[PDB]
Write a protein that binds this ligand. Structure first.
Ligand SMILES: Nc1ncnc2c1ncn2[C@@H]1O[C@H](COP(=O)(O)OP(=O)(O)O)[C@@H](O)[C@H]1O
Ligand SMILES: [Mg+2]
Length: 351
């Protein structure tokens, strides 16, 4: 019995498509509880689901029960960031139907407080670092941003590179992306400009009217290194935590082989031969799924009757995701133990 995957769901206002079809609301929330009415058989018992958070954002932020970008960051964003500081690897991944709110949640709009989890976590990470007053604490921050489209990886921080970059198994340390930019960053503004250009490099699709393809997964990785200098011994100990921030492809379903595999993975872990390597995504995230990571899912939900089956499917995946156990441990520099002895050895040797 370790820790389980945190699972939040979030329902947005009607979008243009839903208003055009005079869509009604079939989603209701109450504390941590989400209820969905079948608008096709309005005579069926509604189905209810209980999560770590049921966020009601169906209205406007002028309203009091509207779950804001700040609230959702502060509930799971901060929690995972604090765990990164404790020396744990963390993952949040946005799951749901095209249009349901995944990229609003993870990225936001950046116009006014519309900033999503990723930009907030980068403001908070850098904000905490520069508030440090222990001089024996110094810090390193390395970012990777990639797209998986149709099982082929691209580098969003290095667009000129057209590499279909190869997903390799390290024979000892597990999977990595060969020759993927790892860029040292020392300012929030600096990391802003990179996930800015990163986003602009995403595969665009005439099908989404030349908006970002709904079939592309966006993985934003920070390698966070904490350096503690000891004067007495002049050893520096390092904490290394990897933060994985994920904006999945559209859940509705060769080139979806990534997303269908995620399902089968989530489902295997829930009832507990795991097909981590049947797809690039489940492979690269083998560890964040049932391994050495603290992981949260934020499922986006359409409020609209027209999306009932997709929106029901998201809820049943969310609810299965709630039964996954993570075996996360603290990044432990063996040198802390070393420092404990050799310092004590010197002081008792001054009786
Ligand atoms: N909680 C929310 N508050 C306001 N607008 C939202 C919310 N969630 C989604 N939207 C809007 O819904 C639309 C869908 O974009 P998005 O949901 O990010 O796509 P996807 O779900 O495919 O990632 C956008 O216009 C976005 O601004
Ligand atoms: Mg999106």
């Amino acid at each position: 019995a370790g820790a389980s995957v945190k699972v939040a769901v979030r329902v947005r206002p009607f979008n243009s498509r839903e208003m055009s079809r005079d869509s009604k609301c079939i989603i209701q929330m109450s504390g941590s509880t989400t209820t969905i009415v079948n608008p096709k058989q309005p005579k069926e018992t509604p189905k209810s689901f209980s999560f770590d958070y049921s966020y009601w954002s169906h209205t406007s932020p002028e309203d009091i029960n509207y779950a804001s970008q700040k609230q959702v960051y502060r509930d799971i964003g901060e929690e995972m960031l604090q765990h990164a500081f404790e020396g744990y690897n963390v993952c949040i991944f946005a799951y749901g139907q095209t249009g349901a709110g995944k990229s609003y949640t993870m990225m936001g709009k950046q116009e006014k407080d519309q900033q999503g989890i990723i930009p907030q976590l980068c403001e908070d990470l850098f904000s905490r670092i520069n508030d440090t007053t222990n001089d024996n604490m110094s810090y390193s921050v390395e970012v990777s941003y990639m797209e998986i489209y149709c099982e082929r990886v691209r580098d969003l921080l290095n667009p000129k590179n057209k590499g279909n970059l190869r997903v390799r198994e390290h024979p000892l340390l597990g999977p990595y992306v060969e020759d993927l930019s790892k860029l040292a960053v020392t300012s929030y503004n600096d990391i802003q400009d990179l996930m800015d250009s990163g986003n602009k490099p995403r595969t665009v699709a005439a099908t989404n009217m030349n908006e970002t393809s709904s079939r592309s997964h966006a993985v934003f990785n920070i390698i966070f290194t904490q350096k503690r200098h000891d004067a007495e011994t002049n050893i520096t100990t390092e904490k290394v935590s990897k933060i994985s921030l994920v904006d999945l492809a559209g859940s509705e379903r060769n080139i979806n082989k990534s997303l269908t595999t995620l399902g089968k993975v989530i489902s295997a872990l829930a009832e507990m031969f795991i097909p981590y390597r049947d797809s690039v995504l489940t492979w690269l995230l083998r560890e964040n799924l049932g391994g050495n990571s603290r992981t949260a899912m934020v499922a986006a939900l359409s409020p609209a009757d027209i999306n009932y089956d997709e929106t029901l499917s998201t809820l049943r995946y969310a609810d299965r995701a709630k039964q996954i156990r993570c075996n996360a441990i603290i990044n432990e520099d063996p040198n802390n133990k070393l420092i404990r002895e050799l310092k004590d050895e010197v002081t008792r040797l001054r009786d």
